[PDB]
DNA sequence: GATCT
DNA sequence: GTTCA
DNA sequence: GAAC
DNA sequence: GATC
């Protein structure tokens, strides 16, 4: 690249040659816990990633660790409390315009733009950890959320039921 | 305000009168589950919030739901898998410069700037849910993380021990 | 399509 | 103080 | 909202 | 990274 990056997220990868020093997926010690869930297909015209479902039964499963692999090289390990389709939706927020707006995460910008430029199909490996049962206010939950996030959700919903709206500082609808 | 806001996070609150239709903390239905944790003190000169620790034994406790209260009014309900100190430092990322850079969340920007402009001490009430025990790869955990986030941390730490670095797409140190 | 947490 | 997820 |  |  030719500019002085102020930060790592501004250094967009340029080609699969930038992955030359990465670790092979074969050398991933936890790989027996992972299965090939889906693939990502870069759509440069529409500045987004499309999905080809592979492990169709798991496409709506939530709470996963994922590995993005390009030509056998590990590009990224991440996670989501949502299904993979929503995590990809989130990556599709990494558009140039939104980075300019300051409304996307630097992570989503870095990854979306890198994958678009590398322009290869990305294999997505996933592991879905078992979810514990937990209690909050004499009610039991089993899901992908942290207990604090779930507690907040119940409390905010109740608040809206009781008061007809969220607090002014809770911006999201 | 006078500009055409493109989004809700750009509408910074200007004074306590902007809270006049908010719900009083005393009418909060879950108030019996919450206890005063700390106060936040706006420091406009330094464009940040300071902390007055109250519930000292809980200042390093992780996994909470919080309520920000200003002159009796509920401004916001939120949560953190970290201690309140770290959530506050995250709010301290809501600086004008960082918003211009696009490197802070719109949430942190909206809240920090609103709290600085209102310029009142904020009472922080908190509830710490009980943490369930759970198993990953035959090891037991009991913490504030979702199972997917913990699983990814465990996997990534092992990845670093094996290959001495993180994947290139994992930007954070 | 776009922002919020 | 400042960016990443 | 989590992390450096 | 979660959400609308
Ligand atoms: Ca992750
Ligand atoms: Ca009124
Ligand atoms: Ca929250
Ligand atoms: Cl969570
Ligand atoms: Cl309520
Ligand atoms: Cl600061
Ligand atoms: Cl490994």
Mutate to test the interface with A, among B106, B146, B149, B171 (most CBs of A within 10 A): B146
Joined together, the tokens standing for residue B140 give 């037991």
Joined together, the tokens standing for residue A22 give 């990465």
Count of the separate structural domains present in chain A:
1
SS3 of B23-40: the string is CEHHHCCCHHHCEEEEEE
Q: How far is CA B81 from CA A126, A146, B62, in A?
A: 23, 8, 6
Kindly report the bases of strand F lying within 7 A of a protein C-beta atom.
1-4
Q: How far, in Å, CA of B133 to CA of A89, rounded?
A: 31
User: Are A75 and B168 in contact (CB < 8 Å)?
Assistant: yes
> Given the structure tokens 């989004």, which residue do they identify?
B7
Distance A91 CA to ligand 4 centre (A): 18
Radius of gyration from C-alpha coordinates of chain B: 19
Joined together, the tokens standing for residue B146 give 């979702």
Joined together, the tokens standing for residue B157 give 């730490």
User: Are B29 and A159 in contact (CB < 8 Å)?
Assistant: yes
CB-CB neighbors (< 8 A) of A7 in chain B: 103
Q: Residue B131, SS3?
A: coil
DSSP A66: E
The domain spanning residue A41 has which CATH number? 3.40.1440.50
Domain span at residue B46?
1-173
B116 close to B47: Cβ distance less than 8 angstroms = yes
A156-160 — which CB contacts under 8 Å span 24+ positions? A156/B77, A158/B29, A158/B30, A159/B23, A159/B28, A159/B29, A159/B77
Determination method here?
Answer: X-ray
Q: Residue B111, SS3?
A: helix
**Resolution of the experimentally solved model in angstroms:** 2.0
Joined together, the tokens standing for residue B80 give 């953190």
B106 close to A103: Cβ distance less than 8 angstroms = yes
């Amino acid at each position: 690249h030719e500019f002085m990056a102020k930060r790592k997220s501004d250094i967009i990868l340029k080609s699969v040659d930038d992955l030359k020093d990465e670790i092979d997926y074969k050398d991933f010690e936890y790989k027996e816990y992972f299965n090939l869930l889906c693939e990502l297909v870069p759509n440069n015209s529409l500045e987004k990633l499309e999905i080809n479902a592979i492990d169709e039964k798991n496409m709506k499963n939530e709470g996963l660790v994922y590995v993005f692999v390009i030509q056998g090289k590990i590009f990224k390990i991440g996670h989501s409390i949502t299904p993979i389709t929503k995590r990809v939706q989130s990556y599709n927020c990494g558009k140039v315009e939104y980075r300019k707006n300051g409304t996307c995460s630097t992570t989503n910008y870095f990854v979306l733009q890198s994958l678009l430029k590398i322009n290869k199909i990305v294999q997505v490996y996933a592991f879905f950890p078992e979810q514990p049962t937990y209690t909050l206010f004499g009610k039991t939950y089993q899901d992908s959320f942290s207990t604090s996030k779930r507690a907040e959700n119940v409390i905010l919903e109740n608040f809206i039921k009781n008061h007809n709206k969220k607090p002014i500082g809770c911006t999201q609808t």
